[PDB]
Amino acid sequence: ELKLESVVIVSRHGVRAPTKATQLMQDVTPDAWPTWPVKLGWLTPRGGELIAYLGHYQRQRLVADGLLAKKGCPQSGQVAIIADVDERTRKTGEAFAAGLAPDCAITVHTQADTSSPDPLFNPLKTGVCQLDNANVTDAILSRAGGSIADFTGHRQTAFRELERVLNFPQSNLCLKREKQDESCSLTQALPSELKVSADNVSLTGAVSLASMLTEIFLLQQAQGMPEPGWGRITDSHQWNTLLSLHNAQFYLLQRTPEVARSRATPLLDLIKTALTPHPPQKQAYGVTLPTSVLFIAGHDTNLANLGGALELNWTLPGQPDNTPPGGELVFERWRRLSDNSQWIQVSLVFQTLQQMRDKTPLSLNTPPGEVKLTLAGCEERNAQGMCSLAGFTQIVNEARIPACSL
Ligand SMILES: [Mg+2]
Ligand SMILES: [Mg+2]
Ligand code: NI
């Protein structure tokens, strides 16, 4: 028997409109990209509704776990929400509060200035710290198989799948090539290189374009749009093949520990603060920690960074995107009653693509997907695979980068 004492949820924001619409995306397909109901990068109403489903589900299961009351609003900081400054993250926090505790108006805290980046969600972005250029380069290239040419060489079945969905042979980038005595290939038409600077890593060309476009197809599906990918994505094998290109870029750029440890350090500190038993104390964002429930509205990069830094690996059954809209990395502190010891469990909770496509209300009898994770570095584990509080504490202390803390 274990008793749930605390939960921290790091969530990607919900479904949002594509953040840019470029000439290159026009040039790789003869077809017209469907337009979205909100501004570039904003949360869609359906995106908010899907988040509220997770909030409602989390209320049900946390009531069943005895952590929140069945009726009424949580009292005095029992639930806290922090969100990145972006509209889509702020609105994700509002949607989660609306599902978790409807009509309770739980405050969605942000940093003071909502017009500039919050270093909690990436300390490299405000120059708190810097990447190690040489070491990051070598690390990403090794994980790519030794070169980006080697990386794309194995993924060419998936690139051909993307070309079919695009009808790439009939695109402007194809047809305006000269001459035509040569076949059309995304990877060869758009050579891909790794670019590393003190504040960012990125991939150029086909690799980054493919990661973006396959995510757009998935967002079209989750948004309920009539025919994602111009109706040329027709079974789950095709979805899994397409999104493998997106997961592969995040594996290189955001999971690689030489990037992830730095980029995740502020979130590691906040998470460890929320999970550690201590007298309640007002801290960052004016939130009092520890408390019962902390929900943090961030981004796919944050999920990937935390997984890379903590050595948490996952694939999501029925959800082709490893870092899907509204995907939740769920940290829990459990007290084992046999000796009143403290234990940390980590999970990935997510809506399957069909649960998004169908706008399926979630509940105890229709739950989201959930993957139980293990901290690979943990040396002190209980019968349920949880890491001891002290073991988890050492892992975070070893994984974090002190220069990157706030
Ligand atoms: Mg339970
Ligand atoms: Mg406040
Ligand atoms: Ni993703």
Numbering used by the authors: 5 to 410
Quote the authors verbatim.
As phytate is rapidly hydrolysed by wild-type AppA, our efforts to capture crystallographic snapshots of its complex with the substrate by soaking crystals with InsP6 were unsuccessful.
The E. Coli periplasmic phytase, AppA, is a 1D-6-phytase (EC 3.1.3.2) and initial hydrolysis preferentially liberates the phosphate at the 1D-6-position on the inositol ring. HP2Ps catalyse the hydrolysis of phytate via an obligatory phosphohistidine intermediate.
